[PDB]
Amino acid sequence: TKYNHDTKISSELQKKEYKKEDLSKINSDFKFWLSVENTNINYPVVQSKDNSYYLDKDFYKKDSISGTLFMDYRNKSIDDKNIIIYGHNMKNKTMFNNLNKFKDADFFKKNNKIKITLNGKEFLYDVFSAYIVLKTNFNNESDYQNYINDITSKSLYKSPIKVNSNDKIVTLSTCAMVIHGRL
């Protein structure tokens, strides 16, 4: 097992979350905590003015090839129709590495959930799609529903879960593995 600065920093931020410390005082760009069931995805999520800055900067805004999980600069509220989060596929089996776990058919059929923790609240997103290979602004239900049947079909396996225009969708993308969860 390889221990380095990036693994030390992230495991310490995880500790500060267990202790209920306010992370945003460490980084004003902090948004919420993200964790996925039966993975080591248990990281902080930040937002910049773009989808590129936190590709090499850690949570402390220092250089880091592991980066920090960040959310699309275009997302605005937890009531957004498709919330997108980007994270690298680091080879320490860290960051968004465990998304490849959703290539296992048994794992997909098992219900592992996407968990967003925001201001002492817990939102649960049920995974319904996983596939190898991004709209946040939907001008009406038609586009949004077209987007739903669009990604429900790309899934490598068919999820028993049925999503429709009255659910909200979270999306975890690498920077490629992609999975989708619904609420």
Automatic annotation (TrEMBL):
Keywords (A to Z) from UniProt: Hydrolase, Membrane, Transmembrane, Transmembrane helix
Coiled coil: none
Residues annotated as the enzyme's active site: 88, 175
One Pfam family in the UniProt entry: Sortase
CDD domains according to UniProt: Sortase_B
GO molecular function per UniProt: hydrolase activity
Nucleus recorded as keyword: no
InterPro entries tied to this protein: Sortase (IPR005754), Sortase_dom-sf (IPR023365), SrtB (IPR009835)
Protein name (database record): Peptidase C60B, sortase B
